[PDB]
């Protein structure tokens, strides 16, 4: 079962003969790819909708609304920025002075992803932002604990940068332009940060996804498998969300169950045939 027509038929049959569900699932599978992830959540209208996100996106917004440079959309957008990946807590501006001076000489925006940033540093950054010295945005690092470190290393491999950690043997004050990652576009809003077209060699990305695949092959619980699959999809594939539409709540729950059944059946049919 490889063609999209057969996948649509399987999804239609598994959803109690609903053609729209099967067609939507086939479209999502085609767009996202083979290594991607599709989830189902509640919608708001009366019609189903599909939202597919390509690239790297995590549920972190900016740490200060004053970073916004486009109030029309209420979002931070940076063109060809630098990415500073620090596996540490930033509180004193003094650690940030050398790299900030260097990027000011370079003249391109900088995105700082850290565990958290204290108020003095936020005040310094927001003061420096609109005064024209430097264009800076700051967000928090996704995840908690080891998974946060794994996500930081994934972003470093994607953007071609190096994570600044104390446990590895480097300090923030000694960072250079080589240690900073690069990308083509960065979009930040209240809730999500999106890195678009990060520069990186395919060899490192493929090595990282192979390592995570081998990790998947040696995991027991389904939650850890799901998290690893989400990471692999963020590295290589895409992420799709299907919003179920219904007038009431009982109808919403019934249709959500049917869509989840169709999704599971399509996965099984793709992996083993019909």
């Amino acid at each position: 079962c490889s063609d999209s027509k057969a996948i649509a038929q399987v999804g239609t049959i598994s959803a109690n003969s609903d053609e729209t569900v099967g067609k939507l699932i086939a479209e999502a599978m085609d767009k996202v790819g083979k290594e991607g992830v599709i989830t189902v959540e509640d919608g708001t209208g009366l019609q189903d909708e599909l939202d597919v996100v390509e690239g790297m996106q995590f549920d972190r917004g900016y740490l200060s609304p004053y970073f916004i440079n486009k109030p029309e959309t209420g979002a931070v957008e940076l063109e060809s920025p630098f990415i500073l990946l620090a596996d540490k807590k930033i509180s004193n501006i003094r650690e940030m002075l050398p790299v900030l001076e260097a990027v000011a000489k370079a003249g391109k925006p900088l995105l700082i992803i850290a565990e958290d940033v204290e108020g003095e540093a936020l005040a310094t950054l927001v003061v420096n932002t609109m005064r024209g010295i430097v264009k800076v945005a700051a967000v928090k690092a996704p995840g908690f604990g080891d998974r946060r470190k794994a996500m930081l290393q994934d972003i470093a491999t994607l953007t071609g940068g190096t994570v600044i950690s104390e446990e590895i043997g480097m300090e923030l004050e000694k960072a250079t332009l080589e240690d900073l990652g690069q990308a083509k576009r960065v979009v930040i809003n209240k809730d999500t940060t999106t890195i678009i077209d990060g520069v990186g060699e395919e060899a490192a990305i493929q090595g990282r996804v192979a390592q995570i695949r081998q990790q998947i092959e040696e995991a027991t619980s389904d939650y850890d498998r799901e998290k690893l699959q989400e990471r692999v999809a963020k590295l290589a594939g895409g992420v799709a969300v299907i919003k179920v539409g219904a007038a009431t709540e009982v109808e919403m729950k019934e249709k959500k169950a049917r869509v989840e059944d169709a999704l599971h059946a399509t996965r099984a049919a793709v992996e083993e045939g019909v």
Binding site: I93, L97, A123, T124, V127, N128, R131, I133
Partner: protein
């Protein structure tokens, strides 16, 4: 005018710099009080045990680096803040 007693010196604290080694503006606790000032008035001199008095080495007009502490006092003269401290708190003279 204000004239200090013995070995005390009156200085005017320099304005704290905003831009540091580039265009990066420092706002908050990062900008510490500058330890440089312009000497305005100089006392007569420290008095020795025997009875002779020797004039201070700092002259009026030079820039000095001073160690702020409990011995340094702040006074508002001519509606302007100045620092009165002993000459022993002066560490070096710039140029």
């Amino acid at each position: 005018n204000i004239r200090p007693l013995h070995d005390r010196v009156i200085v005017k604290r320099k304005e704290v710099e905003t831009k540091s080694a580039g265009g990066i503006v420092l706002t908050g606790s990062a900008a510490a009080k500058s330890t440089r000032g312009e000497v305005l008035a100089v006392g007569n001199g420290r008095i020795l045990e025997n009875g002779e008095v020797k004039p201070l080495d700092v002259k009026v007009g030079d820039i000095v680096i001073f160690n702020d502490g409990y011995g340094v006092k702040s006074e508002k003269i001519d509606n302007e803040e100045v620092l009165i401290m002993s000459e022993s708190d002066i560490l070096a003279i710039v140029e």
